[PDB]
Structure formats: structure tokens, C-alpha cells
């Protein structure tokens, strides 16, 4: 705040504290600590020449120091940071974008009694966790599906059409007739019979004369709306109709939840208070469309193999063109190995972990050539089924959904050759200004096709069916714990109660598509190489996309 005076005379704070006290402690603010007072002596002594008898200068300085403490939350006591806020003041006279992993995402529970979300303190911050702090507690296993049921039932009960209403199952124990609307998990009992389950209880289900609503998938492990008649001669709910819970747009969903900063980039929330913000959204929507079409981030075709030579040559040819106009973000996705890497008892050949390391060293050679792409592009690394830690147990199969990033030990100098590189979990959330994008990599179509209810009674239609099921169920894993185990405390990562604005859903078993639904956009990159053709697609935050091919 100005310079060029004679020299910084040194004076003791005793002759400075009365003015600061009257301006701060009396009127607005308080707690000028002794160390903070000594800190506030240097900057006022920088322009000390001909002052303490002057006019506005000191008062305006104290006013400006108060401006930070009204703006930032800070606290009460003034400490050695007092110079740190004046650095911000002189600062005053893209950004705000992040990539959130599964582990670093904030946790929020839901109270059905209160219709509201309650914060959960993270165990990493306060718990010691020096030896075992990531491990969940058994109580989460008991509430894992109860949390899903509560979220879906709230949405079903707030729909416009419903006001027959959904009845708890145990309310059917004495009735011999009438109709009921039951909502619950569809599964198989320990006896092998199809059944429906809600927190109240369970009931067996008869499909012998069921007429389902075509247009979506009926896989065990998902919420289903059902209608029929209950017979007390046995215990059977004879079904006459079957559907899935309706979906809800995020604009109508946000108002119910207020303005909670779930993926909070505005700020953070703790056990004391939560954060909301509305006025900034308009101006940042303005900035999103303020002639920023130059931003360009690219998702490559999934499942690219580094060990193969033709794939590496095709990637070099693709980066040749990417060098010309550097993408804003470049997301390398899919399994980076063509074979699962396991303990490899045979040591006659070179170890598979060392081979994994070596295959990540050729990337440095191929990438160091293109200096501009290093200089002004950020790369996002998505894991796959055959990466290091998972394949040590699953041996190439698909297991736990929250998949940890690639270890930093076997990939070390790719952080040097490239400028911005971030490793991310299998499900991740890119927060770009007023936009949330979800990155997910698995084969969904095969598992849907294999597991269907099969009621006793052009290929792009399957894509619409998959999109509708995934979006209406509001969850990325419409499956029981048997088909796919889930980390108990990380399940909130996989629940889409607010529908994401943009979705990255790659499946090698499903053809590429571009669909729109209730307030979102779903794109499907897949099969990096196909029919001797290497494909990769571009997407722009202004909701336009392009497909670029290089044999």
C-alpha cells in the first residue's frame, strides 16, 4: 500500500496500540494480541514518515485490515499471520476447479426423521490412523442399504403422481384382499424364491402373471415399484404390474436439499455449520458462457494397452495432433495392462510388477518429445480392472467399486516429464466452475444382460435402457453385495441423488452413444482400438462434442 517515503523508522508498539484498539476492539472486532500488535508495527512503519499526526492514512489502514476479517471468517485472536493478511490485501490491489477422488470426498448421512442431511466428521483428520484408520466399523454394514432405501423412498413419496400410496409390507399381515403399492429391494430368499424386502420386513413374490413396464432393466438388487394382491392362505403377493421409481432432475432436487455444497468448491463444512451459496451461481454461469469456448478437454478411448506396440504407435500419432492445440484436460482411462499382474512365483523371467514399472517408463520417452502438451495440459489418470493392487486379489475380475489410485512407487518420473498429472480413483468427480462431472469405468451392459429377471411371458435402444436405469435408480451399483462388494463407508461416492450435469460412462461391451435425460448428458467413450481404427472423442463445456479418428 504505497512506497517511496524517506525510510522505515522503528517505533515501539506502545505508541501505536491506542489507535488500533479504538478502531478495532471498541467499534467492530477485537483481540489485538501482543504478537499480532508487534506484527502490525512493520507495515505501518514502512510509510512511517510524517505520521501519527497525519489525517486519514492510519485510519484507512486499520479499515482495510478490518476488511479482510469481515471477508474471511478467520477468528478472534490476531497472530503472526497479520502480515499474511496484508499480503492478501496487496494481492487484491483458470482457477477454482478441482478433481475429487473417492477417499477425499466429504461424507453426508441422511436422517429420515428430519428429512435432512447430517455431516459426518472424517476419521482421517481427527483419528490417529497411524496403523489402521481407513478400516470401517461394523455398524455401517447394517445401514448400507437402509441409507439407499431412505433416499429412494423420500424421492418416491415426493413425486407428483403419488400422494395409491406406498404401504409398509408388514401392514399386509392380516389383510386378505385389496391392493397395495410395495416398494423395496428385489432379491432371492435363502430358500431360492423371489422376494421383496423393506426395512419393515419381507414378502415372497409371484411372477407367474406379471406384465412389466418395458423400457428399463429389472436386475436383482434394485428398488422396484410393484402392485398386486396379498393372499393370506399362504404368504404371497401376486403381482400384476411392475415398474421402477421415477427419476428427479437436479434443479428440483437441490431446492429440497437447500443449497448444500456437497462437492463444495465455494468452501468446506464441519460439524458446526454448513455452507450455501446462490448469488455466485448466476455470475459463474455467465463466466461459463463468457466466450470461453477455447477450453477443450478430451477423454480417450477406454482400455488402451501400453504393452502392445501398435497401441503405443497410435497414441504417438494422436499426441502428434494434440500437440498442435493442447487440450485443457486430457483423461487417460482404462486398464494400462493387457494381463493381470499378480505375485508371479516364477522368477526365471522378469517380474510382472517390474514389467508394470517398465511399461510406465516408455510413457516418459513418448511424452517428453511434445513439450507444449507438457507445459499447458493437465492429465487425469483413471485405473482399470488389471491394475496393480486389485489384480493381486481379483486376478483380473471386477471386485470392490472404490478402487484406489495407482501407487506412486512404480510411477515416479512421469510426474517430472509432465507438468500437471493427477491420479484418481475409479469413480471420481471433476468440479469445473458451476459443473460436476462423474468419471466411472466398468462394463455395465454385460452384467445387465447376464442378470435379468426374465419374466415368464436398433441396438442403441439398449443404451437408452441402461441410461434410464442408472439415472432413475440414482445409484451406480444397482446390485447386491454378492455381485460386487462395496466399501461400507465410501458408498456415498456411488449414490447420485443430485443428478450430475455431465456423465462419463465408458463400457467396452456397449457401443458409443450420446444421450440426454432429465437434466444431464451421458457420453460413452470405449474400445480405444476397433476394426484397425483408433478413436477418441472431444467434449466442450458448451455441450458440443466431436469424434476424432486416426487409423
Amino acid at each position: 500500500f504505497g512506497s517511496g517515503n524517506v525510510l522505515p523508522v522503528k517505533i515501539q508498539p506502545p505508541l501505536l496500540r491506542p489507535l488500533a484498539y479504538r478502531v478495532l476492539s471498541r467499534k467492530y472486532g477485537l483481540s489485538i494480541k501482543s504478537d499480532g500488535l508487534s506484527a502490525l508495527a512493520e507495515f505501518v512503519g514502512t510509510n512511517i514518515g510524517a505520521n501519527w499526526r497525519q489525517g486519514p492514512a492510519t485510519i484507512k489502514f486499520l479499515e482495510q485490515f478490518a476488511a479482510v476479517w469481515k471477508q474471511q471468517e478467520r477468528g478472534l485472536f490476531i497472530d503472526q499471520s497479520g502480515v499474511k493478511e496484508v499480503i492478501q490485501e496487496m494481492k487484491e490491489r483458470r482457477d477454482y476447479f478441482k478433481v475429487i477422488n473417492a477417499s477425499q470426498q466429504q461424507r453426508f448421512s441422511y436422517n429420515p426423521h428430519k428429512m435432512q442431511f447430517i455431516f459426518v466428521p472424517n476419521k482421517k483428520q481427527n483419528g490417529l490412523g497411524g496403523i489402521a484408520g481407513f478400516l470401517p466399523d461394523i455398524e455401517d454394514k447394517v445401514q448400507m442399504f437402509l441409507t439407499r432405501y431412505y433416499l429412494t423412498n423420500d424421492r418416491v413419496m415426493r413425486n407428483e403422481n403419488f400422494q395409491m400410496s406406498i404401504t409398509p409390507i408388514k401392514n399386509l399381515l392380516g389383510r386378505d384382499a385389496q391392493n397395495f403399492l410395495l416398494l423395496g429391494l428385489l432379491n432371492k430368499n435363502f430358500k431360492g424364491n423371489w422376494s421383496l424386502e423393506d426395512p419393515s420386513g419381507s414378502v415372497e413374490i409371484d411372477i407367474s402373471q406379471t406384465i412389466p413396464t418395458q423400457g428399463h432393466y429389472y436386475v436383482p438388487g434394485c428398488m422396484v415399484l410393484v402392485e398386486g394382491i396379498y393372499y393370506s392362505v399362504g404368504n404371497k403377493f401376486h403381482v400384476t404390474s411392475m415398474t421402477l421409481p421415477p427419476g428427479e432432475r437436479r434443479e428440483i432436487t437441490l431446492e429440497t436439499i437447500g443449497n448444500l455444497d456437497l462437492l463444495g468448491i465455494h468452501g468446506i463444512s464441519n460439524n458446526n455449520f454448513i455452507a450455501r451459496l446462490d448469488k455466485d451461481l448466476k455470475i459463474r454461469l455467465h463466466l461459463l458462457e463468457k466466450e470461453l469456448t477455447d477450453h477443450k478437454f478430451v477423454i480417450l478411448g477406454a482400455n488402451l494397452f501400453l504393452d502392445d506396440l501398435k497401441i503405443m504407435t497410435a497414441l504417438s500419432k494422436i499426441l502428434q495432433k494434440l500437440n498442435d492445440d493442447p487440450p485443457t484436460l486430457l483423461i487417460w482411462q482404462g486398464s494400462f495392462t493387457s494381463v493381470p499382474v499378480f505375485a508371479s512365483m516364477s522368477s526365471r523371467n522378469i517380474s510382472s510388477s517390474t514389467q508394470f514399472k517398465n511399461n510406465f517408463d516408455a510413457l516418459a520417452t513418448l511424452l517428453s518429445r511434445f513439450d507444449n502438451l507438457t507445459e499447458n495440459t493437465t492429465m487425469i489418470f483413471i485405473p482399470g480392472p488389471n491394475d496393480l493392487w486389485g489384480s493381486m486379489v481379483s486376478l483380473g475380475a471386477s471386485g470392490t467399486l472404490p478402487q484406489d489410485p495407482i501407487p506412486s512407487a512404480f510411477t515416479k518420473k512421469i510426474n517430472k516429464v509432465c507438468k500437471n498429472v493427477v491420479w484418481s480413483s475409479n469413480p471420481t468427480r471433476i468440479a469445473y466452475l458451476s459443473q460436476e462431472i462423474v468419471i466411472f469405468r466398468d462394463d455395465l451392459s454385460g452384467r445387465f444382460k447376464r442378470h435379468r429377471l426374465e419374466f415368464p411371458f436398433q441396438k442403441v435402444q439398449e443404451t437408452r435402457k441402461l441410461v434410464k436405469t442408472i439415472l432413475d435408480q440414482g445409484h451406480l451399483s444397482p446390485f447386491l453385495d454378492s455381485l460386487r462388494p462395496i466399501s461400507w463407508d465410501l458408498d456415498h461416492t456411488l449414490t447420485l441423488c443430485p443428478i450430475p450435469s455431465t456423465m462419463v460412462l465408458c463400457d467396452t461391451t456397449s457401443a458409443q452413444f450420446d444421450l440426454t435425460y432429465n437434466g444431464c448428458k451421458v457420453i460413452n467413450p470405449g474400445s480405444f482400438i476397433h476394426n484397425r481404427r483408433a478413436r477418441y472423442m472431444e467434449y466442450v463445456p458448451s455441450s458440443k462434442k466431436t469424434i476424432q479418428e486416426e487409423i
Binding site: P18, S25, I32, K33, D35, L37, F77, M115
Partner: protein, 208 residues
């Protein structure tokens, strides 16, 4: 009949008033009643539908006017009663919020450090917004023509120049006009009353 539910809401208000009346220290508002309020909203919507239906059924000319007037009046009166109950509940809750906002020396309340009297989730979102603008109004009052007088100061008359105080919570050295106070816990001070009013109000000192 139609308004019989709203009476329950009013009853709840009465209970809150008692907690406001029998309050040696500041208290917290109970949970909001969005479910009951939504029930009155649903029934007044049904009353609006009934009034519409009466409008068409009269304007096709199947019913006598004297007959239709009675149900018209009944629906209007029920809606008026429901409005009265809701407004009374809202005004009582608003008055308590205003009292708390004044009794924290202005400030932004929940965003900044609060005296922990109230939990965040008790208040409704509109109430949370209202509290914010009311606090801003207090703030730009305190910077008006009455700068010298602290409009959020103590409201008990001054009658003791020198008082004995005891520290409740530990802290560091704090500068005051022409001196320093060292807040070592379990220590006693004999000092002028004006210097320690702020610290007593914020819970760092005891006695007077």
C-alpha cells in the same frame, strides 16, 4: 374441521413461548414444523380446488345462489383461519430470532463464531436468510450517526467503577487501551469495569 389441525400448530407456539418466558439464560428454538405446515398447505390447496369447482358449478346454473353462498363463505373462513394460525406461528419464531440476533453484539451469528446457543439445523432456510439480512441491518445501524454509542452494548446501568473478575477460559495476552491483560486461567483481576465488559460478554471472564 378443516382448521382443527392448525390449532395444534398454534398450541406448539404456546409451548415455545413458555420456554421464552421461563428463560434465565438464552435458549434455542425447537425443531421446525414443516410437516404440519405442509399439511395445512395441502388442505388450503384442496379448499382452493373446492372454490374453483363451486365457481364452475354455479356458473353453469344448476344450483341456487343462496345455497352456493354458504359454502363459499365457509371455504373463505377456513382459509382465513389457516392463514392466521400460520402467520402467528411465524411471527413468534421471528421475534425470538430477532431477540437472539440483537443479544449477540450484532455480528454475522452462525457464519462467524457464535455463543453456541442455537444449532444450525433447527432454523428453516428462509429463517436463516432472514437472520442474515437482519444482522446486516444491525451492522449498518451501528455505523450510522450513533458511532460513539454502542447500540449493542450492555443494558444494565453502571454503578461500580472497580470490579473483581475471574478468568473462565485460558487465552493469550490481549492488548487494551494503554495496557495489556494476561489471561492465565484460574487467576483473579482487580480492574475497571469498562475494560472487561467485552470479555465478560464473550464468556472469558466471570463475576462483576
Amino acid at each position: 374441521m378443516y382448521g382443527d389441525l392448525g390449532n395444534k400448530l398454534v398450541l406448539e407456539a404456546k409451548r415455545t413461548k413458555q420456554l421464552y418466558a421461563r428463560s434465565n439464560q438464552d435458549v434455542n428454538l425447537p425443531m421446525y414444523h414443516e410437516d404440519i405446515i405442509r399439511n395445512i398447505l395441502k388442505e388450503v390447496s384442496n379448499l382452493r380446488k373446492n372454490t374453483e369447482y363451486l365457481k364452475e358449478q354455479q356458473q353453469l346454473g344448476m344450483l341456487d345462489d343462496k345455497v352456493a353462498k354458504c359454502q363459499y363463505f365457509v371455504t373463505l373462513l377456513c382459509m382465513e383461519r389457516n392463514k392466521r394460525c400460520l402467520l402467528a406461528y411465524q411471527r413468534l419464531r421471528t421475534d425470538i430470532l430477532d431477540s437472539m440476533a440483537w443479544n449477540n453484539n450484532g455480528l454475522d451469528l452462525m457464519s462467524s463464531i457464535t455463543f453456541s446457543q442455537q444449532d444450525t439445523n433447527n432454523l428453516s432456510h428462509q429463517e436463516q436468510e432472514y437472520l442474515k439480512e437482519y444482522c446486516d441491518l444491525i451492522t449498518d445501524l451501528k455505523s450510522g450517526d450513533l458511532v460513539d454509542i454502542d447500540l449493542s452494548g450492555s443494558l444494565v446501568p453502571p454503578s461500580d467503577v472497580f470490579i473483581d473478575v475471574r478468568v473462565l477460559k485460558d487465552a493469550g495476552e490481549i492488548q487494551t487501551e494503554y495496557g495489556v491483560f494476561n489471561l492465565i486461567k484460574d487467576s483473579q483481576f482487580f480492574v475497571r469495569q469498562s475494560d472487561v465488559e467485552r470479555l465478560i460478554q464473550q464468556g472469558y471472564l466471570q463475576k462483576i
